[PDB]
Amino acid sequence: DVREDRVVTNSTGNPINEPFVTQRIGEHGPLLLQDYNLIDSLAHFNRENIPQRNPHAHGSGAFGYFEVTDDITDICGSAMFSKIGKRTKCLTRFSTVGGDKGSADTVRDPRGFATKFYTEEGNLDWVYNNTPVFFIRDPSKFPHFIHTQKRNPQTNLRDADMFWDFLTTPENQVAIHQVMILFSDRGTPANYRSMHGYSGHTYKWSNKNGDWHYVQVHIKTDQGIKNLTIEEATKIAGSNPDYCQQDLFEAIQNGNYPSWTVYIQTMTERDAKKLPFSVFDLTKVWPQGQFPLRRVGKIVLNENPLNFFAQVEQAAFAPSTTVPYQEASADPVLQARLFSYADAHRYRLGPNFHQIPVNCPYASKFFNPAIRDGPMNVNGNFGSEPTYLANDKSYTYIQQDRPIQQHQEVWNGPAIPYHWATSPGDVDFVQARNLYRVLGKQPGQQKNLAYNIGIHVEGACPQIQQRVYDMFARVDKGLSEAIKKVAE
Amino acid sequence: DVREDRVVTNSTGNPINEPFVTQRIGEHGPLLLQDYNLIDSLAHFNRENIPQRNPHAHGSGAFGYFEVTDDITDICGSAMFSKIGKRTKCLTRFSTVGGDKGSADTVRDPRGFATKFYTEEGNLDWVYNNTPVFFIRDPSKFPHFIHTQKRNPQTNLRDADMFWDFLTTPENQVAIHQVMILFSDRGTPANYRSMHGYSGHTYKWSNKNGDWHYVQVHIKTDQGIKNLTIEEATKIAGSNPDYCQQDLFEAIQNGNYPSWTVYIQTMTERDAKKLPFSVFDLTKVWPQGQFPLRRVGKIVLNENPLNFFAQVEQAAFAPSTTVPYQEASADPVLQARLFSYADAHRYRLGPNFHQIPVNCPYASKFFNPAIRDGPMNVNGNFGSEPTYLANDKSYTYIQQDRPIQQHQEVWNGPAIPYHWATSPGDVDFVQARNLYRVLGKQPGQQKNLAYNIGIHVEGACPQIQQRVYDMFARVDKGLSEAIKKVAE
Amino acid sequence: DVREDRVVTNSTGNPINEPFVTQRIGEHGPLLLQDYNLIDSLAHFNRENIPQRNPHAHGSGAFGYFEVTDDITDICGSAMFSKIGKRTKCLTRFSTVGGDKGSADTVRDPRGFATKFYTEEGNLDWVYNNTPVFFIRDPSKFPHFIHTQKRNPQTNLRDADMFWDFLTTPENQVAIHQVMILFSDRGTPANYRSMHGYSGHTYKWSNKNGDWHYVQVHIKTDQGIKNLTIEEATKIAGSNPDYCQQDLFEAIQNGNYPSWTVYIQTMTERDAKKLPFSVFDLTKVWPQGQFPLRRVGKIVLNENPLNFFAQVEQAAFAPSTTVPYQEASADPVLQARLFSYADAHRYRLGPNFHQIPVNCPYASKFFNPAIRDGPMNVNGNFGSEPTYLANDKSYTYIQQDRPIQQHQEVWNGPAIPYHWATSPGDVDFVQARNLYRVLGKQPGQQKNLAYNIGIHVEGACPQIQQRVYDMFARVDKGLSEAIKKVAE
Amino acid sequence: DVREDRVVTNSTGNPINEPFVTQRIGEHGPLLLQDYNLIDSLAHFNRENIPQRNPHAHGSGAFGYFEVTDDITDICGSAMFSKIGKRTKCLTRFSTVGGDKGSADTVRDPRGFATKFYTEEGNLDWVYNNTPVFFIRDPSKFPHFIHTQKRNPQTNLRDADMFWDFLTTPENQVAIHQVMILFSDRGTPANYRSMHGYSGHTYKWSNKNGDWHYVQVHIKTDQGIKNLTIEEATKIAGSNPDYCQQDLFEAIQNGNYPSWTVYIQTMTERDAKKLPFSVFDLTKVWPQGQFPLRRVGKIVLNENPLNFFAQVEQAAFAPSTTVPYQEASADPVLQARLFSYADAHRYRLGPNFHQIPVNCPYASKFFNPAIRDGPMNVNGNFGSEPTYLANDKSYTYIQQDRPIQQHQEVWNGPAIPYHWATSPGDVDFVQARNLYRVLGKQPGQQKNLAYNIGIHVEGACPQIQQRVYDMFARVDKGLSEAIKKVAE
Ligand code: HEM
Ligand code: HEM
């Protein structure tokens, strides 16, 4: 941190005797190469920026804690859940998805809700979105999808034809449950404090006996759901582009700390076999009548970052950062995510990104003899420790009899290249329709959904507009008509 | 380079069977590591972004040409000015300054106007802004200044206290001429087609006989100055963030090509001595009565880029990229800029950034036996050519009798650490005051200037607000009172 | 590519007046910042180096061709094997393993024999070594193993204790077959032209009718096996560190082109289950009596690189670079190599490494709408092509119903974490013992094996020396006694 | 810092329950994407290497201290020299020049002798060689010269034609004093403890009264000069490539700490005007009769690094890293070096290289409000500190009245493009010849000089060999005859 006497130095600690002097011949002659302090400052300035995240480039963050309020040790044996009242420090980063780093907060998008827990068994990242489902169930489709959400390669404008061309392509129409949620007013939250978080995917949690369950996590806001209409969202995007960032910072600064209650839905393997859809399908939700929400604990965000770049922009979240007893299911999208994020951190941040303080596991320090060297190895590189498992040294492997996934499903089959295209019939449209009816219970929302879709589809090509109307007619023909009226 | 048969392959040209298949055990088991096509696509997706420009992160581009319309061979011996009617291919990137890559087009900022001319004597970059002057005359002050134009290190919000604290600091108040232009409606142009371009700095151009002149360039728009008020600009920022990108793209696409007339002011070393201010000062403009504009040619932008990332985002512009007979003056800001841009390019784009097609000197091929190797050397690396000047090989050095700068000023003095702080008295406030006089001729512009400053200053804390009033009071006391009325 | 008028320019094509002039005040005053040509040259000089390969940092290369001399279309349906007499251009890079970039050629090590074939179905990389087997059959062991082959973390010296401590650790002693080949005089070849290349792993090749075979490839030298003794190799290591590079360059320059004959061993799925060891085990060779060598073609290297950095150092070889009908087996080491190489290339060379000319698939151009952007995208980035599969555009997917691996083995089981430690009994020592008997037919090679191990083991401390004697006594008690005699 | 319980974890602190297990279907089925611990280890392994130094890639290092033993406060006011007996911790890296990272210790080259001093006024780097002079006096000549010292661009072999073609080119022949030293037995030291260090360049040191002197520094070995013959050096280069690394490590390990006595030669500006050559010429030494060695203190190296990579390989040394009262002279080579090293560090190590522990100014902490962000900013990035000089915050600028270089020379002249080619006459050959006579005092050294040049020149082209003989005849015709006799 900052030296107490507050002496301004260059990079190598040499004192600067005047803040702005630059050497030249005389008072107004040519600048000299020997002014190394000028080059030191200008060259570090040129290197301030790292690549923005792809996607979720634009975001906000805050520190807090998770607290266990109820017993779930019969579902999960992770140390962070072992005792009621046990707190684990965390870091949450909220974000949008398609926009670049300087884009506005109040636009229509999913919001990310990524939390990092510093547990005794290492860091745990719950890399969640604010929606129960997502647009795809094929991992290979993700580069293609995010490209259509961003800017046209030539015009560099957000293109409504790309957007809707992808989503109305028959094999991609399984995105419809998610398109409904996006274009409802929940696609434009009032702020980060008044939205939910969801695992989306099914995960597998195990207790210490070896009993395991399929789980889905719900992080419900205690401040309550509050949204903006698209007209309010568009006005605020122009007057204050940093509206949600300002709201989170000011709420924590004023002591009005936001909290969320964490719940899980559990299901056994036998129950999963009896469902009309797959537990490995990201575009489906589990019925809360049959599978109710069991309470686990709370997330309170009570501390602002001191430095946004160092603590939030450099923060790295990955679903592969998991503790014992919490594992990923065979959901194809989650499976690919176990590779993608840590790979992105090695590019965006660097080979030794886990040594950056917010990414460092302080409650369970990194120690691995064979993970050494790399650029910007700053923690000492374990000194003279052998670079392999030397026989005259001692090493501890805890929980040796704990299973990773041996005790779970038995798989059978060849290596099949599979494209989980939109199924024949109505199975991938049922839940979008049930959601349309749930919006009928809330006044003004079915009308708003049609308006939100309509003013966006208006920009599209007439051939693509018709495919949008047909796709939505398969959900509800009344909804399809209402979209067309707004679009024309 | 799209192959005619349009066979979709992976990175190493191996054909893909089906666009979205990913390997797993059975149809719904875990994903397999042997699916190298999935990893190839996801890993390249993670590496799509390069760091944004610091500053001028957000921008638009277009190709076109320069045409000589008048003879100025008496002033400058560069090959691009030799014949009347001579055309040189160019690339122009327009941009804002403080905002990040995804920020809006219609915000208050200077606009960049950087053109790359592909001449027979290598490339030439006229890295200009849309304003006659700039905020600083000390190069060391630029990291500090851009930081106050961006976001607060903790809150990540754009902060009016930082902004006005830097500009009202006594030794930085020489920024006042530029603050005046910034907060006029010229600070929010209607589009890139209806704004000017200016050298800012004094350059030194010389003819083939060895005679030289201090030169300042003026790129005037043929569509005429058209501005927006701040209420209009703020509505469009939320409504269409890419308003000026859309405007430039559509204008060229419809055949309504934007053009600009290029003009220069010239001056002798003797005339520079009879001047009230220094020719090396960026915050000063040369009076057009004494030094009239002399026409040179035209810039017509008539071609959109095919790929924005490859051709506009990877474009690299530098003051140090200059042709024979065009050199930099001893302006300290320009002197440091001869270092900064190429240095920024090596980091942002890479050591061999000049091998990227838009940055390549196609009309004067790069050849240098000692500039070899480096990451991503893709043009052959001159094959087996000696890595030095081998005596059994031939090397041509053209224009050996042409002087660079030894035929110009003679300097005398020691190496002095100098800070060109705001002069005591009125010399650095005179031109801001006469700029206020010129705005009195245009109806409603002085009222708009005071409004634009007043609504911005309104967000600052009382102490800094008072310093802003005193600074503007020194230009005109009526202006200061008018800003204070809007801020209250 | 060199411009024929041979005018020396800087990076941006601007002509240099005099090769070595640098600007200063007067003739002997301080250097000026405005000399951008000096900084262009020095800054590019600073960026010449890329990270060396980890491992195989030190090596040599040459271009040539593969020619089909026999019909093996019943085994493999790849286009490169379709006609007898068909030629495919290739690039081979030979190398050592443990040593850094500046290390000597004639040291004891495996040699790499990596070939890239530019086929009509994309590039094919045969990333082979000069030994039939390898040290490990667990991919997780690879970081640990290369670490012990290199330098001690503190002393930075090659350490005989690390080396033998890893290899004599009980669960790693499956390395013994490879330790035997390494310490024979085959571990110090006379040159790259007089050594063999081997697949190591089993691969799965299939014909156009969907029939497949387990295959192992043998690339036999037509120049004949020639080796150095360790005393000769050590004397040449000091005398000429680049002995093998010089030999390959001069042999091709003098027209004495080296060639190798390619043979395959095939096996069906039924034959594999009758074997006393696993086809997925890298430390095992297939008996030639039961599985004879079948000839395929010839590799002839006949053209030297014009530029070593651009063509050999920037070359990228990966097992995952494979053409249709050639796939990897479930060998765990090969499975991890399917990820490792392409990942290393994205770091070492960069995101768009496949755009570097020698890595470019020229006979089957790279085209994929979703693999876009990234630093140093120099081939145009497909221009205005959509960044997804646009419905108003056309895309060809060839060999749509050709299987990748569905037509092969059916896997069954849970996700088991497995460590394939040295098996009980004699099974992992048998082939090491029969290799010792084969060296008994070639006079002097058994004494040399004992000597080569003895002088290396002598540098280890007595506890580790005893474990080495014990491990080799398990092969042959006579061998063990002879190693002990030389080491003491 | 290794965790006390020695629990092996992955990068994010999650405990590994078995060191080598990798997940697959069944016990011998294909590998799963799900095994993030395998990819964590393999991907970090792929990123262990950073680019080697260019030049001086191969080296060794150790920690120790500098102790003041004599008063020089009348010459230099730097705090590290202020009291007799004052110790300052240091780090020294010794190295060769042209060879790559794996190259041998006992080759013919200059040796580097770079020392970093952790003083109370920041770090100080004395980046010296083990020779009084160097090959060039023009900075632009440096990329060309190092290219000829390394490998041929095509053959990758060290080429005697490149080597001698550059040196015998008439305008480069000022290298002859250095070539004489290089090819004597001083060109192959017995070890790093048996050689001297020299500033090479003239520096300017000032006392607190403003009085200044031109200074040259001599770091004389207390162990005495001890050399190898080229036959001994070539034998050890094959037998033990890490001979000097082993020597330095074991000497410190066994308590036989190497020490050097530091001396300086001082000179006023008036004496500089009376000299027959320039104080700014690197190829000239100052006579010790007239300018005797004045004693300053001692450098003792008494501590080995714990980890070579983190402490020696990541160490960054730069002439621009200097404390108050020590400045560079207008020597054109030193002037360019003020840019080159810190620039190379930004590439090779990263933008925040100064945050790596060995480069950190621990006795005078880095604090600068405007040097922020950048990849791998691990020290907290000064938290919420303003990114500029905020007026409500406090900043200390010490030694405000201490001059940097104003008090020294007054320069006159235009910006001249100058190439300091070999001067006419004998002025650039005189000192090479008196060095030959000093070699005559030692028995066998003039025969060895002729032999060392002869066996190297032998490998060159006949017309280049003739030019070598003509250049050495200009020093001594008997020397030239002896070189010709060995080369044949
Ligand atoms: C196959 C599909 C997906 C892939 C390949 C993928 C990939 C990525 C990548 C590479 C990033 C940027 C990471 C970084 O640079 O630090 C990202 C961020 C993010 N993704 Fe995904 N993602 C996918 C699906 C999803 C889904 C379904 C969710 C929600 C359950 C999700 C939630 C997030 C969040 C919250 C972030 C931002 C984390 C932060 O604040 O830094 N992603 N994703
Ligand atoms: C000491 C002051 C200045 C410094 C150090 C400086 C530095 C920079 C840097 C490093 C960039 C980004 C370069 C890149 O990554 O390609 C930039 C961009 C730019 N600067 Fe400056 N600048 C300064 C003053 C100015 C002034 C006075 C002008 C106008 C005459 C100017 C006009 C521009 C423009 C137009 C761009 C955008 C170029 C593009 O479109 O890519 N700069 N500047």
PDB file of N, CA and C and ligand atoms in Angstrom, chain A residues 53-56 93-95 112-114 127-129 134 136 138-139 142 198-201 282 315-317 332-333 336-337 340-341 344-345 348, chain B residues 42 45-46, ligand 1:
ATOM      1  N   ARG A  53     -13.740  -8.823 -20.738  1.00  0.00           N
ATOM      2  CA  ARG A  53     -14.342 -10.153 -20.721  1.00  0.00           C
ATOM      3  C   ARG A  53     -15.206 -10.389 -21.950  1.00  0.00           C
ATOM      4  N   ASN A  54     -15.211 -11.639 -22.401  1.00  0.00           N
ATOM      5  CA  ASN A  54     -16.030 -12.012 -23.534  1.00  0.00           C
ATOM      6  C   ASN A  54     -16.876 -13.221 -23.116  1.00  0.00           C
ATOM      7  N   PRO A  55     -18.184 -13.076 -22.837  1.00  0.00           N
ATOM      8  CA  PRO A  55     -18.927 -11.826 -22.779  1.00  0.00           C
ATOM      9  C   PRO A  55     -18.907 -11.258 -21.365  1.00  0.00           C
ATOM     10  N   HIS A  56     -19.913 -10.459 -20.984  1.00  0.00           N
ATOM     11  CA  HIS A  56     -20.028  -9.839 -19.667  1.00  0.00           C
ATOM     12  C   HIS A  56     -18.916  -8.845 -19.354  1.00  0.00           C
ATOM     13  N   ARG A  93     -19.670 -10.198  -8.492  1.00  0.00           N
ATOM     14  CA  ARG A  93     -19.632  -9.275  -9.599  1.00  0.00           C
ATOM     15  C   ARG A  93     -20.919  -9.480 -10.386  1.00  0.00           C
ATOM     16  N   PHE A  94     -21.628  -8.361 -10.535  1.00  0.00           N
ATOM     17  CA  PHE A  94     -22.823  -8.275 -11.354  1.00  0.00           C
ATOM     18  C   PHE A  94     -22.440  -7.733 -12.724  1.00  0.00           C
ATOM     19  N   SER A  95     -23.186  -8.037 -13.783  1.00  0.00           N
ATOM     20  CA  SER A  95     -22.810  -7.573 -15.104  1.00  0.00           C
ATOM     21  C   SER A  95     -23.930  -7.699 -16.121  1.00  0.00           C
ATOM     22  N   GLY A 112     -25.375 -11.017 -15.175  1.00  0.00           N
ATOM     23  CA  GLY A 112     -24.571 -11.994 -14.465  1.00  0.00           C
ATOM     24  C   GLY A 112     -24.629 -11.728 -12.964  1.00  0.00           C
ATOM     25  N   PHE A 113     -24.427 -12.793 -12.197  1.00  0.00           N
ATOM     26  CA  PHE A 113     -24.449 -12.764 -10.743  1.00  0.00           C
ATOM     27  C   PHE A 113     -23.464 -13.863 -10.364  1.00  0.00           C
ATOM     28  N   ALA A 114     -22.190 -13.462 -10.358  1.00  0.00           N
ATOM     29  CA  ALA A 114     -21.088 -14.361 -10.061  1.00  0.00           C
ATOM     30  C   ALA A 114     -20.549 -14.163  -8.650  1.00  0.00           C
ATOM     31  N   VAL A 127     -21.043 -19.141 -10.615  1.00  0.00           N
ATOM     32  CA  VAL A 127     -21.132 -18.279 -11.786  1.00  0.00           C
ATOM     33  C   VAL A 127     -22.528 -18.423 -12.375  1.00  0.00           C
ATOM     34  N   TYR A 128     -23.404 -17.560 -11.862  1.00  0.00           N
ATOM     35  CA  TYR A 128     -24.826 -17.616 -12.166  1.00  0.00           C
ATOM     36  C   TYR A 128     -25.326 -16.449 -12.996  1.00  0.00           C
ATOM     37  N   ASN A 129     -26.484 -16.601 -13.649  1.00  0.00           N
ATOM     38  CA  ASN A 129     -27.170 -15.488 -14.289  1.00  0.00           C
ATOM     39  C   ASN A 129     -28.433 -15.180 -13.518  1.00  0.00           C
ATOM     40  N   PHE A 134     -31.269 -20.634 -19.960  1.00  0.00           N
ATOM     41  CA  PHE A 134     -30.445 -19.918 -20.923  1.00  0.00           C
ATOM     42  C   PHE A 134     -30.858 -20.295 -22.345  1.00  0.00           C
ATOM     43  N   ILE A 136     -29.211 -21.652 -24.885  1.00  0.00           N
ATOM     44  CA  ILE A 136     -28.691 -22.816 -25.592  1.00  0.00           C
ATOM     45  C   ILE A 136     -28.530 -24.037 -24.708  1.00  0.00           C
ATOM     46  N   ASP A 138     -26.558 -26.570 -26.424  1.00  0.00           N
ATOM     47  CA  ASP A 138     -25.396 -27.086 -27.136  1.00  0.00           C
ATOM     48  C   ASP A 138     -24.234 -26.123 -26.947  1.00  0.00           C
ATOM     49  N   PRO A 139     -23.093 -26.533 -26.371  1.00  0.00           N
ATOM     50  CA  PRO A 139     -21.965 -25.650 -26.074  1.00  0.00           C
ATOM     51  C   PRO A 139     -21.323 -25.009 -27.298  1.00  0.00           C
ATOM     52  N   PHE A 142     -22.490 -21.480 -28.493  1.00  0.00           N
ATOM     53  CA  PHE A 142     -22.173 -20.257 -27.759  1.00  0.00           C
ATOM     54  C   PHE A 142     -21.377 -19.186 -28.500  1.00  0.00           C
ATOM     55  N   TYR A 198     -29.638 -17.535 -10.341  1.00  0.00           N
ATOM     56  CA  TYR A 198     -30.004 -18.942 -10.441  1.00  0.00           C
ATOM     57  C   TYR A 198     -28.830 -19.737 -10.983  1.00  0.00           C
ATOM     58  N   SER A 199     -28.614 -20.974 -10.509  1.00  0.00           N
ATOM     59  CA  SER A 199     -27.567 -21.818 -11.062  1.00  0.00           C
ATOM     60  C   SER A 199     -27.786 -22.120 -12.541  1.00  0.00           C
ATOM     61  N   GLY A 200     -29.052 -22.185 -12.976  1.00  0.00           N
ATOM     62  CA  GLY A 200     -29.388 -22.520 -14.348  1.00  0.00           C
ATOM     63  C   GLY A 200     -29.256 -24.019 -14.556  1.00  0.00           C
ATOM     64  N   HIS A 201     -28.013 -24.483 -14.445  1.00  0.00           N
ATOM     65  CA  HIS A 201     -27.692 -25.884 -14.558  1.00  0.00           C
ATOM     66  C   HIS A 201     -28.009 -26.624 -13.275  1.00  0.00           C
ATOM     67  N   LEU A 282     -30.537 -27.191 -19.804  1.00  0.00           N
ATOM     68  CA  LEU A 282     -30.461 -25.816 -19.312  1.00  0.00           C
ATOM     69  C   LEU A 282     -31.705 -24.996 -19.605  1.00  0.00           C
ATOM     70  N   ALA A 315     -10.903  -9.620 -11.186  1.00  0.00           N
ATOM     71  CA  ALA A 315     -11.535 -10.794 -10.596  1.00  0.00           C
ATOM     72  C   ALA A 315     -11.827 -11.828 -11.676  1.00  0.00           C
ATOM     73  N   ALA A 316     -11.597 -13.084 -11.294  1.00  0.00           N
ATOM     74  CA  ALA A 316     -11.760 -14.212 -12.192  1.00  0.00           C
ATOM     75  C   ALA A 316     -12.686 -15.237 -11.562  1.00  0.00           C
ATOM     76  N   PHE A 317     -13.780 -15.537 -12.265  1.00  0.00           N
ATOM     77  CA  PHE A 317     -14.789 -16.497 -11.819  1.00  0.00           C
ATOM     78  C   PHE A 317     -14.885 -17.638 -12.817  1.00  0.00           C
ATOM     79  N   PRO A 332     -24.398 -30.396 -20.997  1.00  0.00           N
ATOM     80  CA  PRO A 332     -23.372 -30.122 -22.006  1.00  0.00           C
ATOM     81  C   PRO A 332     -22.782 -28.720 -21.965  1.00  0.00           C
ATOM     82  N   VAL A 333     -23.622 -27.736 -21.624  1.00  0.00           N
ATOM     83  CA  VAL A 333     -23.208 -26.345 -21.532  1.00  0.00           C
ATOM     84  C   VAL A 333     -22.321 -26.172 -20.306  1.00  0.00           C
ATOM     85  N   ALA A 336     -18.788 -27.724 -20.907  1.00  0.00           N
ATOM     86  CA  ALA A 336     -17.893 -26.844 -21.653  1.00  0.00           C
ATOM     87  C   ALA A 336     -17.399 -25.650 -20.837  1.00  0.00           C
ATOM     88  N   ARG A 337     -18.259 -25.148 -19.938  1.00  0.00           N
ATOM     89  CA  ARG A 337     -17.907 -24.052 -19.048  1.00  0.00           C
ATOM     90  C   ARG A 337     -16.818 -24.442 -18.059  1.00  0.00           C
ATOM     91  N   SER A 340     -13.859 -23.378 -20.396  1.00  0.00           N
ATOM     92  CA  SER A 340     -13.775 -22.017 -20.909  1.00  0.00           C
ATOM     93  C   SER A 340     -13.308 -20.873 -20.044  1.00  0.00           C
ATOM     94  N   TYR A 341     -13.743 -20.827 -18.788  1.00  0.00           N
ATOM     95  CA  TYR A 341     -13.460 -19.668 -17.967  1.00  0.00           C
ATOM     96  C   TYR A 341     -12.020 -19.616 -17.520  1.00  0.00           C
ATOM     97  N   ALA A 344      -9.952 -18.566 -20.319  1.00  0.00           N
ATOM     98  CA  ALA A 344     -10.081 -17.142 -20.576  1.00  0.00           C
ATOM     99  C   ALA A 344      -9.265 -16.327 -19.581  1.00  0.00           C
ATOM    100  N   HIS A 345      -9.157 -16.783 -18.329  1.00  0.00           N
ATOM    101  CA  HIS A 345      -8.382 -16.079 -17.321  1.00  0.00           C
ATOM    102  C   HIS A 345      -6.892 -16.128 -17.627  1.00  0.00           C
ATOM    103  N   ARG A 348      -6.740 -13.302 -20.634  1.00  0.00           N
ATOM    104  CA  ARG A 348      -7.147 -11.987 -20.158  1.00  0.00           C
ATOM    105  C   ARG A 348      -6.318 -11.425 -19.017  1.00  0.00           C
TER     106      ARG A 348
ATOM    107  N   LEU B  42     -13.948 -22.653 -28.771  1.00  0.00           N
ATOM    108  CA  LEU B  42     -14.094 -21.955 -27.499  1.00  0.00           C
ATOM    109  C   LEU B  42     -12.848 -21.189 -27.082  1.00  0.00           C
ATOM    110  N   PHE B  45     -12.603 -18.100 -29.194  1.00  0.00           N
ATOM    111  CA  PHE B  45     -13.608 -17.171 -28.704  1.00  0.00           C
ATOM    112  C   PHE B  45     -13.042 -16.401 -27.517  1.00  0.00           C
ATOM    113  N   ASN B  46     -12.349 -17.096 -26.604  1.00  0.00           N
ATOM    114  CA  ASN B  46     -11.745 -16.448 -25.446  1.00  0.00           C
ATOM    115  C   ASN B  46     -10.645 -15.441 -25.739  1.00  0.00           C
TER     116      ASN B  46
HETATM  117  C1  HEM E   1     -21.181 -22.996 -23.283  1.00  0.00           C
HETATM  118  C2  HEM E   1     -21.646 -21.753 -22.691  1.00  0.00           C
HETATM  119  C3  HEM E   1     -20.876 -20.779 -22.047  1.00  0.00           C
HETATM  120  C4  HEM E   1     -19.563 -20.439 -22.223  1.00  0.00           C
HETATM  121  C5  HEM E   1     -18.507 -21.076 -23.115  1.00  0.00           C
HETATM  122  C6  HEM E   1     -19.311 -19.306 -21.364  1.00  0.00           C
HETATM  123  C7  HEM E   1     -18.122 -18.590 -21.367  1.00  0.00           C
HETATM  124  C8  HEM E   1     -17.886 -17.434 -20.649  1.00  0.00           C
HETATM  125  C9  HEM E   1     -16.641 -16.710 -20.653  1.00  0.00           C
HETATM  126  C10 HEM E   1     -15.368 -17.128 -21.372  1.00  0.00           C
HETATM  127  C11 HEM E   1     -16.812 -15.642 -19.840  1.00  0.00           C
HETATM  128  C12 HEM E   1     -15.763 -14.618 -19.469  1.00  0.00           C
HETATM  129  C13 HEM E   1     -14.847 -15.124 -18.360  1.00  0.00           C
HETATM  130  C14 HEM E   1     -13.642 -14.236 -18.083  1.00  0.00           C
HETATM  131  O1  HEM E   1     -13.003 -13.771 -19.024  1.00  0.00           O
HETATM  132  O2  HEM E   1     -13.329 -14.007 -16.920  1.00  0.00           O
HETATM  133  C15 HEM E   1     -18.159 -15.721 -19.326  1.00  0.00           C
HETATM  134  C16 HEM E   1     -18.647 -14.923 -18.319  1.00  0.00           C
HETATM  135  C17 HEM E   1     -19.806 -15.169 -17.613  1.00  0.00           C
HETATM  136  N1  HEM E   1     -20.687 -16.201 -17.866  1.00  0.00           N
HETATM  137 FE1  HEM E   1     -20.586 -17.537 -19.277  1.00  0.00          FE
HETATM  138  N2  HEM E   1     -20.427 -18.962 -20.624  1.00  0.00           N
HETATM  139  C18 HEM E   1     -21.388 -19.861 -21.031  1.00  0.00           C
HETATM  140  C19 HEM E   1     -22.637 -19.971 -20.436  1.00  0.00           C
HETATM  141  C20 HEM E   1     -23.067 -19.264 -19.332  1.00  0.00           C
HETATM  142  C21 HEM E   1     -24.239 -19.615 -18.550  1.00  0.00           C
HETATM  143  C22 HEM E   1     -25.271 -20.668 -18.939  1.00  0.00           C
HETATM  144  C23 HEM E   1     -24.209 -18.840 -17.429  1.00  0.00           C
HETATM  145  C24 HEM E   1     -25.053 -18.864 -16.319  1.00  0.00           C
HETATM  146  C25 HEM E   1     -25.466 -20.050 -15.585  1.00  0.00           C
HETATM  147  C26 HEM E   1     -23.046 -17.979 -17.577  1.00  0.00           C
HETATM  148  C27 HEM E   1     -22.720 -16.944 -16.719  1.00  0.00           C
HETATM  149  C28 HEM E   1     -21.633 -16.101 -16.863  1.00  0.00           C
HETATM  150  C29 HEM E   1     -21.324 -15.013 -15.970  1.00  0.00           C
HETATM  151  C30 HEM E   1     -22.113 -14.616 -14.733  1.00  0.00           C
HETATM  152  C31 HEM E   1     -20.188 -14.439 -16.438  1.00  0.00           C
HETATM  153  C32 HEM E   1     -19.450 -13.241 -15.872  1.00  0.00           C
HETATM  154  C33 HEM E   1     -18.509 -13.539 -14.724  1.00  0.00           C
HETATM  155  C34 HEM E   1     -17.850 -12.252 -14.260  1.00  0.00           C
HETATM  156  O3  HEM E   1     -18.529 -11.404 -13.693  1.00  0.00           O
HETATM  157  O4  HEM E   1     -16.657 -12.082 -14.474  1.00  0.00           O
HETATM  158  N3  HEM E   1     -22.326 -18.279 -18.715  1.00  0.00           N
HETATM  159  N4  HEM E   1     -18.810 -16.845 -19.802  1.00  0.00           N
END
